[PDB]
């Protein structure tokens, strides 16, 4: 466990005190693991990286970088959180607040960005000292990997326009991804840099491989076994893409590292690895929105 | 929930020296004359 | 320079009731924390007690 | 209880605001720790003698 303290700063109001009473059991990110911490390491204003507000890329860099902490008991003058990342595996049971999907008896939930849901939901602001606590969303591993690839696919059809990607049933429920009225116009400008990252790593590599493999095999165990498991797959992709597209070794192999350098960035960026597990005891095995859940430490 | 809500003060002593004379008790008065003979 | 710096501030709302003496009777009314390096050349040229 | 130098002339009257001002106490941590090795746990208790 090793409970860590976050210091409440000076004079706040009772609704600012009540804002601290509506967050008992949320998820909090922090840079270092000092046993006494302040609120200045917590806020969304502490996420500035280039002088501007971070995007969902700029958050997911930090959301994979800094450290999760879960507030067990709220306090005046302190914030007690028993942090997840310390402790041995499957010990130190902690309690979370669900958001609209289930969080079943297993699932290994993952912290991720707020604007994939309602952006000014869970962006809880302190009014007196004027800071913003944008709490991440704890989604389980199948659906968390599902919704992350859909909006960036929806960003493509929103990029250069001329089915509807947004229905996405759960096991029982119909999950309305679209919060239309004011959010989706802010969606395609807050995942704005991120869509370019999913695109440029595809346009580079595919246009690199179609001048790599024809430059390979004649420049032999990898030669004949290139299309051995790729018979009528890669040569068919050589038949389909190389015809309706365009067609240099020393810049090429220089571009080989650079794309694959960007590839190693995105794997750390994407895919939303599990950090904490739901595997409770004597529950109804099914969590609802706004209800607590016993959550155990390691995947 | 604490004390030390107290300060103290007075001012005399030099408060008579620079003054350098005094008549007290002015009654219901209309005119004050002092004439000089040199 | 010191003598205004000696009394640029104002006395607080405070009587200690436990005073630090001066071996004669004199109560002490200031602290004046300084570094080690400054205190050397300050004392030998600006006398002394 | 600030003083008054209550004035002559028809400039209007002084008024003693003997106000109660408050302050706010902070809270500080001041944390310290010390190690203890893998031995001297059975020792200093009475196990490994």
Short mmCIF file of C-alpha atoms in Angstrom, two decimals, chain C residues 4 6-7 12 14 16-17 20 22-23 27-28 30 32-33 38 40-43 45 47-48:
data_model
loop_
_atom_site.label_atom_id
_atom_site.label_comp_id
_atom_site.label_asym_id
_atom_site.label_seq_id
_atom_site.Cartn_x
_atom_site.Cartn_y
_atom_site.Cartn_z
CA UNK C 4 17.01 51.71 8.93
CA UNK C 6 17.24 47.61 11.96
CA UNK C 7 13.85 49.33 12.12
CA UNK C 12 4.49 42.63 16.43
CA UNK C 14 3.71 40.25 21.13
CA UNK C 16 7.00 36.97 25.12
CA UNK C 17 6.88 36.82 29.00
CA UNK C 20 16.46 36.66 26.42
CA UNK C 22 21.97 40.62 27.84
CA UNK C 23 23.72 39.72 31.15
CA UNK C 27 15.85 42.44 26.59
CA UNK C 28 16.57 41.43 23.00
CA UNK C 30 15.61 41.20 17.00
CA UNK C 32 19.19 39.22 12.14
CA UNK C 33 20.09 35.84 10.63
CA UNK C 38 28.83 37.93 5.27
CA UNK C 40 32.89 37.66 8.90
CA UNK C 41 33.61 40.91 7.09
CA UNK C 42 30.68 42.63 8.78
CA UNK C 43 31.86 42.20 12.37
CA UNK C 45 34.74 46.50 10.48
CA UNK C 47 32.00 47.14 15.92
CA UNK C 48 31.14 44.98 18.39
#
